[PDB]
Design an enzyme around this catalytic site. Structure first.
Site, PDB file in Angstrom:
ATOM      1  N   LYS A  41       0.858  -1.171   0.000  1.00  0.00           N
ATOM      2  CA  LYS A  41       0.000   0.000   0.000  1.00  0.00           C
ATOM      3  C   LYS A  41       0.890   1.214   0.000  1.00  0.00           C
ATOM      4  O   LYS A  41       1.770   1.347   0.850  1.00  0.00           O
ATOM      5  CB  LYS A  41      -0.888   0.010   1.248  1.00  0.00           C
ATOM      6  CG  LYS A  41      -1.840   1.212   1.325  1.00  0.00           C
ATOM      7  CD  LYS A  41      -2.793   1.065   2.502  1.00  0.00           C
ATOM      8  CE  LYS A  41      -3.761   2.237   2.618  1.00  0.00           C
ATOM      9  NZ  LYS A  41      -4.875   1.925   3.569  1.00  0.00           N
ATOM     10  N   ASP A 135     -15.717   0.436   9.473  1.00  0.00           N
ATOM     11  CA  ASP A 135     -16.052   0.458   8.081  1.00  0.00           C
ATOM     12  C   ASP A 135     -16.035  -0.945   7.515  1.00  0.00           C
ATOM     13  O   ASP A 135     -15.448  -1.198   6.495  1.00  0.00           O
ATOM     14  CB  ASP A 135     -15.109   1.398   7.337  1.00  0.00           C
ATOM     15  CG  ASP A 135     -15.602   1.771   5.971  1.00  0.00           C
ATOM     16  OD1 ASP A 135     -16.790   1.745   5.711  1.00  0.00           O
ATOM     17  OD2 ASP A 135     -14.767   2.063   5.140  1.00  0.00           O
ATOM     18  N   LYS A 137     -17.208  -4.117   5.586  1.00  0.00           N
ATOM     19  CA  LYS A 137     -18.021  -4.298   4.379  1.00  0.00           C
ATOM     20  C   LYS A 137     -17.362  -5.333   3.480  1.00  0.00           C
ATOM     21  O   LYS A 137     -16.175  -5.621   3.638  1.00  0.00           O
ATOM     22  CB  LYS A 137     -18.178  -2.969   3.613  1.00  0.00           C
ATOM     23  CG  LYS A 137     -16.857  -2.283   3.316  1.00  0.00           C
ATOM     24  CD  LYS A 137     -17.012  -0.968   2.526  1.00  0.00           C
ATOM     25  CE  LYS A 137     -15.638  -0.304   2.393  1.00  0.00           C
ATOM     26  NZ  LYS A 137     -15.639   1.007   1.681  1.00  0.00           N
ATOM     27  N   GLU A 139     -16.219  -5.289   0.645  1.00  0.00           N
ATOM     28  CA  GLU A 139     -15.076  -4.769  -0.105  1.00  0.00           C
ATOM     29  C   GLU A 139     -13.766  -4.870   0.692  1.00  0.00           C
ATOM     30  O   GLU A 139     -12.686  -4.998   0.119  1.00  0.00           O
ATOM     31  CB  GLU A 139     -15.349  -3.309  -0.525  1.00  0.00           C
ATOM     32  CG  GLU A 139     -14.166  -2.590  -1.163  1.00  0.00           C
ATOM     33  CD  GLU A 139     -14.516  -1.197  -1.683  1.00  0.00           C
ATOM     34  OE1 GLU A 139     -15.498  -0.594  -1.200  1.00  0.00           O
ATOM     35  OE2 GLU A 139     -13.800  -0.698  -2.579  1.00  0.00           O
ATOM     36  N   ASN A 140     -13.885  -4.819   2.015  1.00  0.00           N
ATOM     37  CA  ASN A 140     -12.760  -4.908   2.951  1.00  0.00           C
ATOM     38  C   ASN A 140     -12.512  -6.297   3.520  1.00  0.00           C
ATOM     39  O   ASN A 140     -11.613  -6.481   4.345  1.00  0.00           O
ATOM     40  CB  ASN A 140     -13.065  -4.048   4.175  1.00  0.00           C
ATOM     41  CG  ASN A 140     -12.866  -2.600   3.923  1.00  0.00           C
ATOM     42  OD1 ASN A 140     -12.216  -2.199   2.954  1.00  0.00           O
ATOM     43  ND2 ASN A 140     -13.421  -1.787   4.799  1.00  0.00           N
ATOM     44  N   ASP A 153      -7.883  -2.913   5.876  1.00  0.00           N
ATOM     45  CA  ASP A 153      -8.244  -1.490   5.838  1.00  0.00           C
ATOM     46  C   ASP A 153      -8.612  -0.916   7.207  1.00  0.00           C
ATOM     47  O   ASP A 153      -9.787  -0.835   7.550  1.00  0.00           O
ATOM     48  CB  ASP A 153      -9.380  -1.241   4.835  1.00  0.00           C
ATOM     49  CG  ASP A 153      -9.469   0.217   4.403  1.00  0.00           C
ATOM     50  OD1 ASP A 153      -8.714   1.049   4.948  1.00  0.00           O
ATOM     51  OD2 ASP A 153     -10.287   0.529   3.515  1.00  0.00           O
ATOM     52  N   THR A 166     -19.027   3.650   4.798  1.00  0.00           N
ATOM     53  CA  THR A 166     -19.716   3.481   3.521  1.00  0.00           C
ATOM     54  C   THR A 166     -21.226   3.423   3.741  1.00  0.00           C
ATOM     55  O   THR A 166     -21.717   2.605   4.517  1.00  0.00           O
ATOM     56  CB  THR A 166     -19.238   2.210   2.813  1.00  0.00           C
ATOM     57  OG1 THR A 166     -17.807   2.194   2.801  1.00  0.00           O
ATOM     58  CG2 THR A 166     -19.759   2.153   1.383  1.00  0.00           C
TER      59      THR A 166
HETATM   60  N1  LIG Z   1      -5.020  -1.907   4.440  1.00  0.00           N
HETATM   61  C1  LIG Z   1      -5.530  -1.909   3.132  1.00  0.00           C
HETATM   62  N2  LIG Z   1      -6.108  -0.776   2.728  1.00  0.00           N
HETATM   63  C2  LIG Z   1      -6.595  -0.785   1.487  1.00  0.00           C
HETATM   64  C3  LIG Z   1      -6.536  -1.869   0.648  1.00  0.00           C
HETATM   65  C4  LIG Z   1      -5.921  -2.988   1.144  1.00  0.00           C
HETATM   66  C5  LIG Z   1      -5.753  -4.170   0.326  1.00  0.00           C
HETATM   67  C6  LIG Z   1      -6.400  -4.300  -0.886  1.00  0.00           C
HETATM   68  C7  LIG Z   1      -6.296  -5.411  -1.696  1.00  0.00           C
HETATM   69  C8  LIG Z   1      -5.471  -6.430  -1.246  1.00  0.00           C
HETATM   70  C9  LIG Z   1      -5.070  -7.710  -1.725  1.00  0.00           C
HETATM   71  N3  LIG Z   1      -5.495  -8.256  -2.895  1.00  0.00           N
HETATM   72  N4  LIG Z   1      -4.234  -8.293  -0.862  1.00  0.00           N
HETATM   73  N5  LIG Z   1      -4.094  -7.412   0.139  1.00  0.00           N
HETATM   74  C10 LIG Z   1      -4.818  -6.271  -0.040  1.00  0.00           C
HETATM   75  C11 LIG Z   1      -4.928  -5.172   0.778  1.00  0.00           C
HETATM   76  N6  LIG Z   1      -5.410  -3.018   2.383  1.00  0.00           N
END
Ligand SMILES: Nc1nccc(-c2ccc3c(N)n[nH]c3c2)n1
Length: 279
Positions: A41, A135, A137, A139-140, A153, A166
């Protein structure tokens, strides 16, 4: 004890973009020395400072460092160069739970039960550390190669002892009070279970404002094709009074939640060792 030297961008072969938000982009990276894959990230310092996001970036790092559990994305390392911050995270090869919901429409009862149990088990661990996600969801909630969940996240997390998530998953107390607690996560859980079973989130409308209207009025309903025990469980989570949600402290915590008839056949002690039901 001596930790490894700080890693650097040159240690990695960067690849495809895994996600992007307003303040961050996640990129798949292969560490050259090990062949290990990480989800890195990347945050632009100037943008973070310019938008007053330093406390969020700081909270995410401090929270992900305290978590040590299979159902949570792990923070392996951090480094920076002149312009950016890098967080090395677990790579969940199968992406978002949201993707699977869309791909198959809705979950049968076996899959709903298994994945709900993992989320409950994940929340029990998070909440026992006095941490609130705020948060939660689909998506997370990521899926690793093994098809076990990995929640990620934590920029928006609260550590117990301000922000609104969200829209579809916002709890009523956030709209009427501007205050969050562990019960807000349990509300989101109610929405997620409903979504796994119905194929769609419970509170839907043409815009944010109308979604909020529905939330505070508890205006949603169940489809005829809804597992009766799942329905009963959702009705005990989607409760306006936050102190009356199954799982919260005033309802005596995770014991009664985990003892719900919907989870009758679940073995809680070793979910991560079990083989997920095929999707
Ligand atoms: N902490 C955080 N914040 C935002 C996005 C993510 C995130 C998104 C996608 C993946 C993945 N495919 N593997 N690991 C991920 C971690 N992680």
């Amino acid at each position: 004890p001596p930790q490894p030297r700080k890693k650097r961008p040159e240690d990695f072969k960067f690849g495809k973009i895994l996600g992007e938000g307003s303040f961050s982009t996640v990129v798949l990276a292969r560490e050259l020395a090990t062949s290990r894959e990480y989800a890195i990230k990347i945050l632009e310092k100037r943008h973070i400072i310019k938008e007053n996001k330093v406390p969020y970036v700081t909270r995410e790092r401090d929270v992900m460092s305290r978590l040590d559990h299979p159902f949570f994305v792990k923070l392996y390392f951090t480094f920076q160069d002149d312009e950016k911050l890098y967080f090395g995270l677990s790579y969940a090869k199968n992406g978002e739970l949201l993707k699977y919901i869309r791909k198959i429409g809705s979950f049968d009862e076996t899959c709903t039960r298994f994945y709900t149990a993992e989320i409950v088990s994940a929340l029990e661990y998070l909440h026992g550390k006095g941490i609130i996600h705020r948060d939660l969801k689909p998506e997370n909630i990521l899926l690793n190669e093994d098809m076990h969940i990995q929640i990620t996240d934590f920029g928006t997390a609260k550590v117990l002892s301000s922000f609104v998530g969200t829209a579809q998953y916002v709890s009523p107390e956030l709209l009427t009070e501007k205050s969050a607690c562990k019960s807000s996560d349990l509300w989101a859980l109610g929405c997620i279970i409903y979504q796994l079973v119905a194929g769609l989130p419970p509170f839907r409308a043409g815009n944010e404002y109308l979604i909020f209207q529905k939330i505070i009025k508890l205006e949603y309903d169940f489809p005829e094709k809804f597992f009766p025990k799942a329905r009963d469980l959702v009705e005990k989570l989607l409760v306006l009074d936050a102190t009356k949600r199954l799982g919260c402290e005033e309802m005596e915590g995770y014991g009664p939640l985990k003892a719900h008839p919907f989870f009758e056949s679940v073995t809680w002690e070793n979910l991560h060792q079990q083989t997920p039901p095929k999707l």
